[PDB]
Design a protein around this nucleic acid. Structure first.
Ligand code: K
Ligand code: MG
Ligand code: MG
Ligand code: MG
Ligand code: MG
Ligand code: MG
Ligand code: MG
Ligand code: MG
Ligand code: MG
Ligand code: MG
Ligand code: MG
Ligand code: MG
Ligand code: MG
Ligand code: MG
Ligand code: MG
Ligand code: MG
Ligand code: MG
Ligand code: MG
Ligand code: MG
Ligand code: MG
Ligand code: MG
Ligand code: MG
Ligand code: MG
Ligand code: MG
Ligand code: MG
Ligand code: MG
Ligand code: MG
Ligand code: MG
Ligand code: MG
Ligand code: MG
Ligand code: MG
Ligand code: MG
Ligand code: MG
Ligand code: MG
Ligand code: MG
Ligand code: MG
Ligand code: MG
Ligand code: MG
Ligand code: MG
Ligand code: MG
Ligand code: MG
Ligand code: MG
Ligand code: MG
Ligand code: MG
Ligand code: MG
Ligand code: MG
Ligand code: MG
Ligand code: MG
Ligand code: MG
Ligand code: MG
Ligand code: MG
Ligand code: MG
Ligand code: ZN
Lengths: 125, 141, 18, 60, 23
RNA sequence: UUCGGAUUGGGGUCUGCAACCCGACCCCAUGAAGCCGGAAUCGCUAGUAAUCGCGGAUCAGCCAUGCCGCGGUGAAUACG
RNA sequence: AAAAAUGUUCUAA
RNA sequence: GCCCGGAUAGCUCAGUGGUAGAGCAGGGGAUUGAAAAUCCCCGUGUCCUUGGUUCGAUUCCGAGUCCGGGCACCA
RNA sequence: CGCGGGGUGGAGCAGCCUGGUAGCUCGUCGGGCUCAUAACCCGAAGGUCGUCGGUUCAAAUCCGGCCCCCGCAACCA
């Protein structure tokens, strides 16, 4: 429960452990460490509680994160379905949003295959 | 046809038919009624025969109140059997009806229209009957 | 009863209109 | 839809983007080579006649 | 890998440049 | 997972009269399935297969991971 | 010295 | 006289309370050289009458009509 | 309302006796092999157990009533 709500894994370097926080990919971890003067290569269990509270303060306040980011993402999707735009309908039906083909792919968006019967070939004779 | 939805016991001993009706002796709901003058077990079939006669006489108009209910199971052995071997099987339901019981009422219809309908109703029934209209004695109860 | 395939039920002609 | 589309591609359009090649020999919209002004078929036809300067069936 | 636009590898694949592979 | 880079949020760039349906690209964030694939099944006998990147036609742009070429590195095995 | 059944009608250009 | 059962499309029949299916007959599409077959589409109806329950009945309950049948000396 | 048995995926059978579990063969659907069909091989789906009521913490399973389906019996007179 260290930062923000996330207990970032000890035994890994800081720059990587920071990524385990919803809202921080590799590039933001590069900033916070430069903008607060901690070695990017210090294993997390090896941070002074001076560095911890230093990093925690900047991280928690520069950008928005784990639970709040999730809520803003949710409000945007929520917004699109309300106005009833095209991207809104594709979120309702759970289909792709960015123009992909749906004839034959989209399993990330569609789910496991719900196999149904096919048109029968005629018999001979 | 009328009958209880559930019963605590399937078969009931045969009644007695002494005395004036326990209650239901005053017009309660409608303007005109049909009163028993003799005791009887009135059948579900008889009750439905009186009801449909009045319904067709009103040509669906007005209101009809059935103030008896055939809750009593009526048992009967198969034909041509001997006595014994337990009680016969339930074959229908009767309503016990003693003199002074208001069995049916009508409302929302002409006096003349009520009178006729209750007369016809009475011809379906195995007892002498009487037609009544709601007096202040009825409202005093 | 118009241009190409599928057929519109008239011989030779299809459903597509111009 | 052939001849009125031979003409239309010639007409200068309402917008730059609506320009497109056609074979000048046969009218084909597809597979039109800029160097020749010709579709890939007419190309192969006129080539084999030697009516195409310097063009020769490659091999290597 | 080549599908990773965010690496010098994925820019070599899509034939593009940027922060993750300048020129 | 510093494997994988699908999906989705946001913010830009460009071509184009115009990128909602329906473009490519960039950056932040997100970071799915996938742990080597059932029955079955394809290619290749040498500078070949495998692996690496480069170019061109079409073309404003591009859905090219396609196609036609180009060289780098460079095997295994054939009893019959 | 043989595991393993079958191929609708008319037409044979 | 009394008991049971059937009545739904042009024909043969499904159907368990919100006026409905099939097959087959006919036509068209796909398929084919053209058929057969297979797949799709189209027209089919007061669901026999009458009363009742129900907001609502082809559907549940009763009757009627027509058809189809069932009763049983006797020691 | 003489006696007996039965009602469970689409078909035919287990499970019940002994309460906690639904099973087997075919069939259906998807994919292989084949020029193609069949056989064959790899996967998948489908039954709240006739019905209503009770007992139980829990009912296909135990107990009652109803519907339906087979079977057996009806002698002396
Ligand atoms: K004897
Ligand atoms: Mg993260
Ligand atoms: Mg699409
Ligand atoms: Mg056949
Ligand atoms: Mg007695
Ligand atoms: Mg007295
Ligand atoms: Mg009384
Ligand atoms: Mg009293
Ligand atoms: Mg009696
Ligand atoms: Mg009695
Ligand atoms: Mg007795
Ligand atoms: Mg009795
Ligand atoms: Mg009388
Ligand atoms: Mg009077
Ligand atoms: Mg089509
Ligand atoms: Mg036109
Ligand atoms: Mg163009
Ligand atoms: Mg062109
Ligand atoms: Mg990763
Ligand atoms: Mg990576
Ligand atoms: Mg976006
Ligand atoms: Mg677009
Ligand atoms: Mg691993
Ligand atoms: Mg492999
Ligand atoms: Mg060779
Ligand atoms: Mg590779
Ligand atoms: Mg290329
Ligand atoms: Mg191009
Ligand atoms: Mg696309
Ligand atoms: Mg043999
Ligand atoms: Mg045969
Ligand atoms: Mg008679
Ligand atoms: Mg009848
Ligand atoms: Mg036909
Ligand atoms: Mg048609
Ligand atoms: Mg044809
Ligand atoms: Mg034809
Ligand atoms: Mg009726
Ligand atoms: Mg009926
Ligand atoms: Mg069954
Ligand atoms: Mg068995
Ligand atoms: Mg057993
Ligand atoms: Mg058991
Ligand atoms: Mg099973
Ligand atoms: Mg199959
Ligand atoms: Mg052939
Ligand atoms: Mg086969
Ligand atoms: Mg039972
Ligand atoms: Mg139970
Ligand atoms: Mg129970
Ligand atoms: Mg159980
Ligand atoms: Mg004897
Ligand atoms: Zn040409």
């Amino acid at each position: 429960a260290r930062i923000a709500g996330v207990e970032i894994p000890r035994n890994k370097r800081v720059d990587v452990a920071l990524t385990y926080i919803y809202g921080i990919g590799k590039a933001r971890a590069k900033e916070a460490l430069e903008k607060t003067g901690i070695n990017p290569a210090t294993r997390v269990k090896d941070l002074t509680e001076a560095e911890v509270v230093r990093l925690r303060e900047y991280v928690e306040n520069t950008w928005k994160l784990e639970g709040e980011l999730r809520a803003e993402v949710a409000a945007n999707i929520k917004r699109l379905m309300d106005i009833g735009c095209y991207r809104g309908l594709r979120h309702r039906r759970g289909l792709p949003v960015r123009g992909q083909r749906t004839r034959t792919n989209a399993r990330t968006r569609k789910g496991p295959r719900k196999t149904v019967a096919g048109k029968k070939k005629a018999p001979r004779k | 046809m009328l009958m209880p939805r559930r019963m605590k016991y399937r078969k009931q001993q045969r009644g007695r038919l002494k005395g004036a009706t326990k209650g239901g002796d005053y017009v309660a709901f409608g303007d005109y009624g049909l009163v028993a003058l003799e005791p009887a077990w009135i059948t579900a079939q008889q009750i439905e025969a009186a009801r449909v006669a009045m319904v067709r006489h009103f040509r669906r108009g007005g209101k009809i109140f059935i103030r008896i209910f055939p809750d009593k199971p009526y048992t009967k052995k198969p034909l041509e059997v001997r006595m014994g071997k337990g009680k016969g099987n339930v074959e229908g339901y009767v309503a016990v009806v003693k003199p002074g019981r208001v069995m049916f009422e009508v409302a929302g219809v002409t006096e003349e229209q009520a009178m006729e309908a209750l007369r016809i109703a009475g011809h379906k029934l195995p007892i002498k009957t009487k037609i009544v209209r709601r007096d202040a004695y009825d409202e005093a109860q | 009863s118009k241009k190409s395939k599928p057929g519109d039920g008239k011989f030779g002609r299809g459903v597509k209109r111009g | 839809a052939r001849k009125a589309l031979i003409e239309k591609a010639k007409r200068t359009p309402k917008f730059k983007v609506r320009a497109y090649t056609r074979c000048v020999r046969c009218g084909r919209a597809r597979s039109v080579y800029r160097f020749f002004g010709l579709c890939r078929i007419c190309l192969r036809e006129l080539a084999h006649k030697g009516q195409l300067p310097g063009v020769r069936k490659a091999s290597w | 890998g080549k599908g990773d636009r965010r690496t010098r590898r994925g820019k070599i694949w899509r034939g593009t440049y940027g922060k993750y592979r300048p020129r």
